[PDB]
Write a protein that binds this ligand. Structure first.
Ligand code: HEM
Ligand code: HEM
Ligand SMILES: CCCOc1ccc(-c2ccc3c(C)cc(N)nc3c2)cc1CN
Ligand SMILES: CCCOc1ccc(-c2ccc3c(C)cc(N)nc3c2)cc1CN
Ligand SMILES: C[C@H](O)[C@H](O)[C@H]1CNc2nc(N)[nH]c(=O)c2N1
Ligand SMILES: C[C@H](O)[C@H](O)[C@H]1CNc2nc(N)[nH]c(=O)c2N1
Ligand SMILES: [Zn+2]
Lengths: 407, 411
């Protein structure tokens, strides 16, 4: 019950005791593993607060101290009357950093304690939200020297006043159904690009059209906002060997800033909390160019490489995928925009695992998601046994707003 | 209660009722997933339930559930247990069991072939020499001059755990691993331990880089014995590259027949501790793991040098780039010699078809995503985007401890 995990490349063994703090469920049972499934009141709220506040005050080495019990009774009394409660700034920051720290699917968590937290809990309007997001974006980009950030809009109250950023990421390209069959722009975002038009967006109908922001504050009909272009840093994609690679007319944006998840701290629910860091190369090149429901430039790259595309066993897809990913990293590094290759970041994660087992007794991890989408076996996380379990504070999934909004 | 999985690349959903037949425990709990853990003498007290269950399955498969042939067989196995404390499978039952063991192998991507398994009943074997002759015929039959045919050879079942039959090799054909004084390894680093046991048991090692290891065979719980597979029975393929003519000069070769020998076949409560089984290679098993894993032959950096790659920063992706070429050369060498091999794209596509077919005509197909996804180019194969349900069905192939850890040495 004090589980162990083994790295089979190095024989390192770590003993996991952190998992016995786990609260939520995984979806798995004694009889069935779901490790690869994508998505599984006043009386409930107070224990959730006690638990969070207990771990908060131990983290600062004041468990059982005067300040601890007073803060507990303070929160205790506010739940009684107000039915909820508000986090002190210090807890807000702790909670945001530990939701990233507990993000069992995130490979970049070695940076978790350097997060920049922007308290936007005083926001009241979509224009307000837009101001906060533009500030987040500018701070995060930092002229290419990217910095981790999260901006936290007001907590849920009764589900009727939800703050929601309707974009899945703050910065994403547009996707348009072409009359003939295929897709122009980016096929992931075709339905959202519809909604923006459905809401009043003048789509330029190019390939790399930065989508507008669709901001929803206090539960009202959301509003369209154009991010100032000078805040959207983009990297034109070129290959350090193949001159013809520029001709494909490819670029990506520098700032990955995920905006559709829900942040849960001490039982409180922050449905608007866009957070950002920086890209691993494969997130753009393997996934955001080469997945069959994405750009499928794989064929053109290999065509332009005059590779034998007549049978899968020439591995021409793999060979193109490598080149594309070499190009994505070359371009970002050439323009001094932060990016991490998948060898770099998996080795960091292993180091971070080491540190978590050493000074925390464990580290929840979702092997299925930590292993990069190419070259998995030659990265050091492949041979790393991991234990997956759900800790609080956390980032959670939430329904898309456009299935729920009382319009 | 029914369960659903979604393929996110195609939006195809499938409903699994077959997990309800699951009994063995996965290692996971409601609060902890052990989905990435490598590894998460039986009395008649609990053997007839296991027998009845298997026999219920078998007679369902032949649509004779509840027939007099079915009830009589139950009654026959019944008396044989209380009287002998074990029981014997009919040939039919043994063949069903071995096929369904493979069909239930949730980590195996090659299961589209599962019904075509050639089952060799070696349950009359009694000695190590007897085993050597059974294995030699397996190898010849399965190889078939490069037109590989999957087979399994099933040796006698465990009785009291003190008379086990064991193949001590992890595979029938593997290359020797030699640890040098200077700390380097000659041959296959994966086999250094087994090689030393062989040498200690009296094997005269050629001490080369691709020495086929001797068979180490154990019958009836006796001390294991060494035998050299005849070299004309070991089909090998020298590794060359279709564009690089310096690749042949790395002097690499690999053998054609993957044949796993260290696992335990469980059928209806009986344990078959020695049951080597073979099929044919997916290319990445040689190209990605057998050559490029940091703890294996690790010709990665030598291939990168001959390719004159930027080996300074990892972000030149030289490792990925050399990996692709090495897998290109493995597929090319095998196809050039008409030795059966499958690339990882072809095989993941087949498994998806297989998996979909299994959901429709069986109500489920247990599958270990961690293992099914290929160890390179994972996301550009259709299993990466495929949700999977993992559960243990019997008959099954199980792991078992290395015999040299548990053996009682006669002397
Ligand atoms: C700083 C560099 C970072 C890198 C390289 C990184 C990398 C990744 C990767 C590769 C994934 C896997 C999903 C996929 O590949 O499609 C992921 C998931 C995730 N990231 Fe990180 N990340 C970073 C920063 C952050 C930050 C700052 C946060 C929040 C404060 C965060 C929160 C998450 C969460 C919650 C998930 C999992 C979401 C889910 O369960 O669906 N990440 N990340
Ligand atoms: C004929 C073509 C076959 C192919 C291409 C194939 C491929 C694979 C691969 C790639 C793995 C992953 C293991 C690794 O990569 O380290 C695997 C696992 C496995 N294979 Fe298959 N296989 C084939 C036939 C068979 C046959 C005939 C059997 C037995 C009758 C079998 C039994 C298994 C089992 C039991 C596992 C799971 C290993 C475990 O649980 O540790 N396979 N297979
Ligand atoms: C629904 C299937 C996709 O799931 C995913 C997949 C990935 C991420 C994710 C989240 C944050 C990231 C940050 C901060 C930096 C970075 N470099 N990468 C990230 C990737 C979120 C989700 C949830 N939408
Ligand atoms: C705990 C270590 C897991 O390792 C492994 C790794 C691989 C296989 C395996 C087994 C059979 C195969 C056949 C018939 C064909 C083929 N092409 N590949 C196979 C690969 C088994 C095990 C379990 N002994
Ligand atoms: C079906 C499968 O579980 C799903 O596609 C997951 C698998 N692992 C992943 N891993 C990462 N890093 N990112 C992903 O989007 C996914 N997708
Ligand atoms: C830690 C991890 O579970 C382990 O290294 C597994 C992962 N998946 C694998 N998948 C395959 N096909 N072969 C393997 O050897 C492994 N190793
Ligand atoms: Zn699980």
């Amino acid at each position: 019950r004090f589980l162990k995990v083994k790295n089979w490349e190095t024989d390192v063994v770590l003993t996991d005791t952190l998992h016995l703090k786990s609260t939520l469920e995984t979806g798995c049972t004694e009889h069935i593993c779901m490790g690869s499934i994508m998505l599984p009141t006043k009386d409930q709220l107070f224990p959730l607060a006690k638990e969070f506040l207990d771990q908060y005050y131990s983290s600062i080495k004041r468990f059982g101290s005067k300040a601890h019990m007073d803060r507990l009774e303070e929160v205790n009394k506010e739940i009684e009357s107000t039915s909820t409660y508000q986090l002190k700034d210090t807890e807000l920051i702790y909670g945001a950093k530990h939701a990233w720290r507990n993000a069992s699917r995130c490979v970049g968590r070695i940076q978790w304690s350097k997060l920049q937290v922007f308290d936007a809990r005083d926001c009241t309007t979509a224009h307000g939200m837009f101001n906060y997001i533009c500030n987040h974006v500018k701070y995060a980009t930092n002229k290419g020297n990217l910095r981790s950030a999260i901006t936290i809009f007001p907590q849920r109250t009764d589900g009727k006043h939800d703050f929601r950023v309707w974009n899945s990421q703050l910065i994403r390209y547009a996707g348009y159904k072409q009359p003939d069959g295929s897709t122009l722009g980016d096929p992931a975002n075709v339905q959202f690009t519809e909604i923006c038009i459905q809401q009043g967006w003048k789509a330029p109908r190019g390939r790399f059209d930065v989508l507008p922001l669709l901001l929803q504050a206090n539960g009202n009909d959301p509003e369209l906002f154009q991010i100032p272009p000078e805040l959207v840093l983009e990297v034109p994609i070129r290959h350090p060997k193949f001159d013809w690679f520029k001709d494909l007319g490819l670029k990506w944006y520098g700032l990955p800033a995920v905006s559709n998840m829900l942040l849960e701290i001490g039982g409180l629910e922050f449905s608007a909390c866009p957070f950002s860091g920086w890209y691993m190369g494969t997130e753009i090149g393997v996934r955001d160019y080469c997945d069959n429901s994405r750009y499928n430039i794989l064929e053109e790259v290999a065509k332009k490489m005059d590779l034998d595309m007549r049978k899968t066993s020439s591995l021409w897809k793999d060979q193109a995928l490598v080149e594309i990913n070499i190009a994505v990293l070359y371009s970002f590094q050439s323009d001094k925009v932060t990016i991490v290759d998948h060898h770099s970041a998996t080795e960091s994660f292993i180091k971070h695992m080491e540190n978590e087992y050493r000074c925390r007794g464990g580290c929840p991890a979702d092997w299925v998601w930590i292993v990069p989408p190419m070259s998995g076996s030659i990265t050091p996380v492949f041979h790393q046994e991991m234990l997956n379990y759900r800790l609080t504070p956390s980032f959670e999934y939430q329904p898309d707003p456009w299935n729920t909004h009382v319009w």
